[PDB]
Amino acid sequence: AEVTQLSNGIVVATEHNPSAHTASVGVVFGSGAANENPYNNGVSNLWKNIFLSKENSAVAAKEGLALSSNISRDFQSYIVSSLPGSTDKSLDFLNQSFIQQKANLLSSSNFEATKKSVLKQVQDFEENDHPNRVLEHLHSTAFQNTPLSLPTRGTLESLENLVVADLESFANNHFLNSNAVVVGTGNIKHEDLVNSIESKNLSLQTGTKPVLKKKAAFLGSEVRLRDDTLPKAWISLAVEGEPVNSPNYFVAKLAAQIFGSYNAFEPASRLQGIKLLDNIQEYQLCDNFNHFSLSYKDSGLWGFSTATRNVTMIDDLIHFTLKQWNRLTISVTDTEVERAKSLLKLQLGQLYESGNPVNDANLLGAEVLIKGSKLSLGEAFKKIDAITVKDVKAWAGKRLWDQDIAIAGTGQIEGLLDYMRIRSDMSMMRW
Template structure:
């Protein structure tokens, strides 16, 4: 077969994106971030919002605000050549307008996302819509529910324990004053960052457009930050009527400003992810994947490193129809975690670094960027991120794992047919091993 040199050069010349530019104007942070995968996205990022700034009585109010922004503006945006979206995270909320005309996008965001009266339009209808979505979520998205339960038990009675999705009970009990109070408290000017992503950006012109925004109706007083604290614990909701088991185990991870932020992410990618129905998953080469394939003990797993303002979670989430082999996979996974401290190889780390680079380059979403902004981390270019990842060695992974993973307390969550998931003490004992 002939190899095309044109094809080779196409792959070799994929451009990186250049450095983001940051400016302060009128107490607002303005960022332009070049991206080859975006077409002039303009986003408002509020770093004092999200579920961690809700409570157990108004949980889900962010989702109502997000749905209000989308529902009340979708038709108008389409008419003007835009697409609107709003996303909610643990520590942020974003409002995005995607389209070619940046000036019109900013104008629309000012009218729709920065004006409380607009966000309160059609409150009852929007509330009913969000309740319906949440009920469907609670009865079908078990992997995401396990993740929310993991946060709830790991960060008990602290801000990160509050679920992003809200609950159907709390959302149905909201009144419009709850929304109004949340907007005044969380969608504030002093925590606002305005981001433009795309190609051929003009930072100075964008800053000039932002400086003309009328923000007199936006509150400038925000609530103080409350730290979340990790505690080793578990929550299990066994339900044998479900077709499989979902479970997750994690230790405390790194914050977004930690010097070991990328070390933790590389460590997670040493084990990566696996899906039984995806052919590519069988060819990753990790020892954990080889164990899974040899004994056919699981349907899928994914290792993660989630980072927030002052803490994080590092671990895995798994699901399986082979409910009598849950304990085997858990044992294999934790023994591989032990190996991070003593025998992870340079080859494994090199493969993990390349996998992480691909992941970062493929996920240039406003959500991932907003998490960094909300946590107070520097917004870096792809080149800067790749440079930081390239510096990580096997010794760095071993040192980090010895401090953060070896013999550390864990958080466990699970639902479905989880009878074979070992008790907490036995799993906790697997966090260490005889080294001699």
Template sequence: MAAAAAVFRAGNAFLRARRPTLFAAKRFQGSVSYAQTVANIPETQLSTLDNGVRVATEESDHPTCTVGVWIEVGSRYENEKNNGVSNFLEHVVLKGTKKHSQLEEEVESLGAHLSAYTSREQTAYYMKSLAKDLPKAMELLGDLIQSSSPSEAETERGRKLILQEMHEMESNLEEVVFDYLHATAFQGTPLGYTVVGPTENIKSLSHSNLAEFMNNHYKAPRMVVAAAGGIRHAEVVGLARKHFGGVPFKYKNDAIPVLAPCRFTGSQILVRDDALPLAHIAIAVEGVGASSPDVVPLSIASTLIGNWDRTYGGGVNQSSRLAQISVENKLGHSFQSFNTCYSDTGLWGIHLVCDGLNIEDMLHFAQGEWMRLCTSVTESEVTRAKNTLKTHLVAQLDGTTPTCADIGRQVLSYGRRISLAEWNAKIDAVDAQMLRAVCSRYIYDKCPAVAAVGPIEQLPDYNRIRSAMYWLRL
């Protein structure tokens, strides 16, 4: 998601990363069935502290654990003048506190790993360590969230680091084209902002801007302390009460931030650069929010379109029809279907990478597969996609860190963690008829958002792309 994006999207840094067994207790049972594995997943336990911080855990017998705090804040909570402040703040917070001025050395002395990320709707700080070091990890995270007081010099170092990262990101055309896609699809709204913000903002944001943003948004009811691995829920709750119980829950003048609706606009943004070797094209329709019941059918549809890279084996024997077509006609270098969900809206589409001369054909076949989803997809294809999606759901939770992240994101998005068994039941309830109906509702005859970067002279006119969003039928 963002939250369901994390569950379903086959493709924002942490969210696109690919993840021994779900449970160490089962690693010696090579014949354990999928149904048994799902049934044996420990229950996610959830408690709430007096100040509103939620504590959610999944216990296992791993020798390691991951604990983190997920906060309901990101670039969508920013405005045009301070866009980028969430990501800037995340970088500065990791510089340490007065109590832990040598943070990196402390973490390394434990053999642990501390990291963080910022997305459009969430910010997270998490730490993986030996299970016995859980108390130290919780103490470090609690101090970072509540006592971070970087000096002006540290703020400047953070500024230089972000500007350097922004320069490096320009070479990651996948990230670039997705930022452009958001910019055109949600133009004039906060979802159109990039997570890192524009260069001029990063250069002008002050130490006081960061402190003000943190005071306004790092509030207890918007936090989830999540933990997974060799931990016990009661211990985590006790440590959270000790280290996060002091997080404030009141807003100044009771001015609680409320997200404004972000409208979707069918439109395009094109950045032609013939010096680049390959064209990157992202095309999407408006998807659904994480809590929509249609998120599952749309995720199955995205899985059915699939993803492919020319380095894959299998050739024309790929399960994805679009992959078969790409191989047979030697069209693209890669493609990746995606279903990105935010709290109240989303993007459902595909990212294509191909030679400039193959753009028109790749778009033609991709949109043709979209129309087939709406009109003639078969039961066997849907069954195969459902099984693939179930496998992806299990694979994403392979380890304490992705499990912890899944807990944090889902509790922020849904108020609870939806179990794999419940996801599977939702998946099983979808048949070909339902899939065609849902796809027709969101894809058929809809105005898409298009972003393209590179040698895109052969990209069809927007009206032609729009006309391929329906089929003339007798």
């Protein structure tokens, strides 16, 4: 399905969907918040809001175009959406506003206003979005003193000292042909997109991105942000996981699907075939939880997140969930593996067939920027169907059984026990 060409230093990747009603083109760079430093943290967040500023969007609206941008730890993207008969109109807008003529966007009275608004978005996030700011501190403590520990939005102190010359420095080092992929998804054709870049002579700078010194290194630790005025307790807990291109990439995702997610107020979520629900529903230990498997270029995280109002029984919630992780290493049934196989395929099928061309562009560019190509959905289903119980036991034995953990929490967390008490629950003396 997907086609990738290297006509020049830039790479062109596409995904033709003839039964769609929109098209999207854009550029994805192989740099994110992991390519900054504590003192300029949030520069890549400021660049996203410059692309989506009022003056830039007014020009695109008059032509019937919509702008989208996303910042991650390993990549950032700038997308333009349009009707199927106006693909060359979007390529021209991307060229004249981003690839070249970037000084008018970076003008004064536009940098100042955009900077003032981003400072407000960051302050609100740090005071209202408790479940998401806890997951950001989990990265901060698991990979402390490392590129992989910097928040994707920046901090109030990095942004407050950012100045006029700081944004131009970053784009020189990172917005280059060797660091970029041009992506077209929706009702577009590979031949029609390549024939348009070769005519307009589109090209970025011809440098090379700097090479970092350190690498990602997991360290067992914890950070606690207690706040007795909040009504709940939010907690995140994880061990070291798998990076992308790991052989055990789908085993770790299947292992997270065995315990899944839960919502106390949804009647159908209380009937799921998860044995953990039998210990936590009698006394209402939590309101919701979800298990994840995050994968980056160098490392990853594997764990779960919870929000609860039962502040006097937090230890029971942590004790019971970790004792269920113990069964992956020693005793996990065939039915649990077969059920998780069917729910992982459904979950992946929804993510890669959402029908939104903007979502597909982000997933396509990020995959090509690392692996060089993109694995087919049918090929992924074959690998998922081949996992056995012996593969789960081997994986969990080396990653989960008696291993260090990282913990982050906020709210009413007086009932969360010490590190060593929680750490000692990662195995058991009975086996």
